[PDB]
Design an enzyme around this catalytic site. Structure first.
Site, PDB file in Angstrom:
ATOM      1  N   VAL E  48       0.902  -1.103  -0.052  1.00 11.89           N
ATOM      2  CA  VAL E  48       0.048  -0.116   0.147  1.00 11.89           C
ATOM      3  C   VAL E  48       0.856   1.180  -0.058  1.00 11.89           C
ATOM      4  O   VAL E  48       1.935   1.313   0.802  1.00 11.89           O
ATOM      5  CB  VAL E  48      -0.932   0.010   1.267  1.00 11.89           C
ATOM      6  CG1 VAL E  48      -1.781   1.353   1.205  1.00 11.89           C
ATOM      7  CG2 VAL E  48      -1.737  -1.275   1.096  1.00 11.89           C
ATOM      8  N   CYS E  49       0.362   2.131  -1.045  1.00 11.03           N
ATOM      9  CA  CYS E  49       1.397   3.283  -0.945  1.00 11.03           C
ATOM     10  C   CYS E  49       1.187   4.407   0.470  1.00 11.03           C
ATOM     11  O   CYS E  49      -0.186   4.204   0.967  1.00 11.03           O
ATOM     12  CB  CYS E  49       1.026   4.337  -2.162  1.00 11.03           C
ATOM     13  SG  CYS E  49      -0.839   4.625  -2.021  1.00 11.03           S
ATOM     14  N   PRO E  50       2.219   4.318   1.019  1.00 10.85           N
ATOM     15  CA  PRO E  50       2.307   5.058   2.287  1.00 10.85           C
ATOM     16  C   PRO E  50       2.023   6.461   2.534  1.00 10.85           C
ATOM     17  O   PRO E  50       2.684   7.251   3.146  1.00 10.85           O
ATOM     18  CB  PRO E  50       3.687   4.727   2.605  1.00 10.85           C
ATOM     19  CG  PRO E  50       4.669   4.308   1.508  1.00 10.85           C
ATOM     20  CD  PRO E  50       3.812   4.237   0.523  1.00 10.85           C
TER      21      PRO E  50
END
EC number: 1.11.1.24
Lengths: 167, 173, 170, 171, 170, 167, 172, 167, 172, 166
Positions: E48-50
């Site tokens: 998941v893009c942080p």
């Protein structure tokens, strides 16, 4: 639950007794130096003639002369004890009496002596002999019907006293 | 140890009562279908005039007219209960009385209703009101000196059965 | 769970009350030296007329004259107590009243006096009479339908004060 | 006795009497199955603090209603005090009329189950819970008594939950 | 099990964090005198893009100007934290970031904040706001999927700074 | 708390491992019928060279040829296990490896095996040898500094396989 | 029941051992300042070649040169421990040996170390390595058939006292 | 802790004994129908002359002829028992002997007989006579130093055999 | 520990008694259908004249005539009971006697009746009257010195079986 | 329940014994400094010949001469012990005897020594040997019928006195 053991000190008790028509605080220790005949009877104001209590009251003098006192006890209130004395015989009363009538209303003394009937709410017929040094020497427990002998109590008191010196 | 809780069924009791000069076995379940005013008083043969008990005996008919029965209880023997009634009122007795005197000698009922004094060996002055379906509806516990009102007990029974008034102008939303 | 025993000291309480329109910290001991009639009622802002609460407020003059005070209590917040008092009687309110309304919001006082109903979230109809020495002398608990008599409460207080001097009289 | 409110476990059941459009109605958490429910606590009716947060939901309820969402408020006050609040005009200290239910948690059971009850004060924190259509708790928000609450943030949050229920794992 | 209670002091924590590529011992008490935004995220090196960590890292300067510091936390080792930062954004990493990444490897802090999942072995998405005296002021717990608003977080600190002097006024 | 007893079945474990670059559910029972060398190591992405793990990965064929499998375990997430493998050796990684990397993120397996360090939040250096019946036959526990021998592990497996047939 | 935990102090023990043909009181603390390889073996006078015990007695100088002593233990009495020693190796004995044979007749020592087999009445094959400050550093527990390597034991000890990476590898 | 009570069935025991140089599983029930003298001695390979044990080994035939068997027991391993027997009397050993040496290695039999010494890890000098019906008939416990009479034991057994018929 | 409660069934006992010079199993249930006077006395072969036991034995016929039996009990062995009886009154013995002497050697009976003295190892002087239906109706307990009246026992039994008012007395 | 342990101090006991026809208070500590043979036998006035009790009484001088005493014990009253002794050996009695007869009426001693039988109410046939320092050294328990050897007891006492030196 019973605290009454032979040749151990008699269980301490205290409460209000009716003595010669008056309320007085009475304790087991008041009778130190004397033998005490201490007995329970079921109830005041019953339909059974109170011959045994009267018999002790009448002949009390035979006890007094051998250094013995006598005390009666029921679970009735001290107010009920009095009414019994102050109630005429034709109507069921006891009349005046020459032994104290001790009230064990909260049932505590009955229980300590192990004569209380949990379900009846009153006592057995029990008689205890406690010596002048304050030790329980004799226990008598009768089922509800059978009365109690003044002569026999006397025989017992004398025998305890006699053996107190020579054995 | 107390079993008496409001609007839960009143704790069952049964014991010997003195009713009309005779010993009769009485139990709480006998009063089903009627309201019962059940009250305790400390002791018989006291030096306090038993006016509250008498007052109930005298006015007992007013309770009867609203389907209510009345039973008094003390920790005294039924034998003592009898003698009291058979002792003239003039001589310190209760005299004849028109309500039963229930005996709680083994203290079981007092403890159930939470009115027994462990160290005194008798009850408070306690009064309980129970409905016709056998549910406790009211509890009154007085310290030993203060007596109890027939009028007020009557007011209460009527009030539980029927269902002080509102100031004019007061309205709800 | 109840701490209230006759002729043992009445259970201590403190909380915020509305007294003559203001919030005030009130404690049982503030009433030391006077008899206190302390009573609970179920809820503020219901649709039933508060006859019992009003009757005490009107006849308060009779209690004060025999050295007795009156405090009413519910599980409502002190803010709801105030809104009730400041809401006109024509509007469902209590209107101004001359006995304090004590708030027992966290239910602690109700539990102590044993008048709290676990499932309803409010009190029974309970009245306790406490003497000047801070001892519980009377407990009265009514099922929800039946109200409470000022006359009968006055009688009890008078009887307790009287016997406090001459113990028992005919 | 402690909090029953766990994220992604079924939301703690509650039921009680609420005031809805001025009337008493028996209300339960299961009544909101198939829709998202925003369920929040506020401390007390009739305070001197403006009920701006409760009102804002009432004003904007329709934005929630249109995205298959309901909103319900709760305090430890009786349903009678709740009513009295609504029927007091908005500026003379009341709430004025409102289009979301006011749930009464007089016996404190719901507040304790949601872990928002204050044992000593006798009322709630400021708490907001977001619960899904399957009745599962998805979000918990707890504010100290003073700070109010954003309809907007709540609105977005409801939306983010709805998105991840279908196309969930990616930015 | 949770020690985090609103308006009580925030649960003490201490551990090793990664700050600008270096290992640093970090404690709640270092943030005495400032507002602190302290938040958990599930895992490092995820798919998941942080963004939330980045979004906070990007706008960290707005926090600094309103006297706020920020700390992110996961149950990953500090060593894993480092590799993430040192892994390029194109490769799934965080790339360099301007907030500290605190390691809660022995799970003790997640459990104290009540954000640990016994079965997953990692955290919820949780954010806590702590005032300058070290008192917990706000709790936000999100189910694992939903990201987080910087804005709303920013607003809340301001609402708290605002109500700490004047308190909420109408 | 440790469930690991010699010559009782080795404690069951299951979790997500990285095997040949993919995430796979792995359980102790997958190794029924083969001997298993199951060992823990503290952490991925440390500053210490992963020689012991690489040494097991390189010489794995010697194990396969004696009907033995090998599994490594740390408390790191499987995403971290993957990244390590996918991190170049130059940049600190493990590179590709031919033994599974088991992730014990919730610490449950370590606790079952008595190799978890309560305070550190990761494991000891522990190696357990489990037979074809899923029974624990050997336990080896090292303090944090000391590495682990392939040769010695091999000797131990052979000794157990040898004595399994001819005493 | 086992008291032996890594990097905590090794469980205290004391008892009678056979050292140079004599009975001597030996306790763990006698070995402070030195590393101790303290290991158990199941029984004296068996039909299994005591190759592992002999190998330690033989190469003992290698331990001594790295400040380590060795003590072996079984549940046999010190008297049986002696008789084993006074029987020639070719004739089934251990013959004389240069490590102590500690006797744990009442099983108290075995239990502390968690190597007693309750039903058999003897020990596992267990080996413990303890450092110079008296802290337990290594545990090796083998099922009954399999013996123990002196080389490997030595390797472990050196490594504990001392404190080779794949090519191209550097940390970040 | 002792299970051995007079005139109750003797506590069951079973274990490996050394008989004529061989390991054999022996149990008390094997001695049904015969009287058994079952006695404990502290240790093999001690510095005390085994005079009491050998005397039984020498004179066993007097026992066989009054239908009695004799078995000795120590907490030593069956392997230590064999070495004792295979060490000549001349060498400090027991030499070959014709009564079984029962091994109570796990101490269970000793404890059952109430003869285990918790701190020494070995037995008392204890002797039990069990009749042909498997009933414990006689108990003897001696301080550690003192030897034991064959003559005297035979006398007791016969008396037990005699009263089995007459009185 | 005492089982004896008034108007509950009397506590069961059984043991060996000496009856007319012979050993017999006697149990409480043998006396069903009759009243039983069951009494304990401290010890045999004392220096105290055994008058109370003899007095019952002599006047036993009065009991028998009101459907009552009498059994004496002490903690002495039945063998000692026999020797007592077979020891002449001239020699300090009891001589022959017409009530059974029950032996309570293991103290089990005494404890059941609450008449055992823990430190002395014998009984106080206690007497129980049990009805024909097997119910305990009376308990009498004396300290060791005081004997017991046959007349009084008799009075009591008749009283239980049978079931005098101040003059002027009438009930409600 | 038994307190009697080998090579531990003998359990203390005290009670009334009949010694040479008189009642005397006796305690174990009285035998401090001499060896004591302390043994139980089941009952007085039994039908079993008291040959074992008598044999000790007759040969008492051999024990006295090796600084050893002998005391017999049963659960019978001291009054019964006396009556037994005063019953002639001819009439089934024990007759006069030269060892003390200790009474263990309250069962306390039998129980401390582990020879009391709860259901029978008397002792086993048990004999204990205690040294001059009051240490329990030897225990013998026989089923009820079977007697005991004076000689073997003598052999044992001597063997104990012997190892007391060497």
């Amino acid at each position: 639950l019973s605290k009454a053991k032979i040749s151990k000190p008699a269980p301490y008790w205290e409460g209000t007794a009716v003595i010669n028509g008056e309320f007085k605080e009475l304790k087991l220790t008041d009778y130190r130096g004397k033998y005490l005949v201490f007995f329970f009877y079921p109830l005041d104001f019953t339909f059974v003639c109170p011959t045994e209590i009267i018999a002790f009251g009448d002949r009390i003098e035979e006890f007094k002369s051998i250094n013995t006192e006598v005390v009666a006890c029921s679970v009735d209130s001290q107010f009920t004890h009095l009414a019994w004395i102050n109630t005429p015989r034709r109507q069921g009363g006891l009349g005046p009496i020459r032994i104290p009538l001790l009230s064990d209303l909260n049932h505590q003394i009955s229980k300590d002596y192990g004569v209380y009937l949990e379900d009846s709410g009153h006592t057995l017929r029990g008689l205890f002999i406690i010596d002048d040094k304050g030790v329980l020497r004799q226990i008598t427990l009768n089922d509800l019907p059978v009365g109690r002998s003044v002569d026999e109590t006397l025989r017992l008191v004398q025998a305890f006293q006699y053996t107190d010196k020579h054995g």
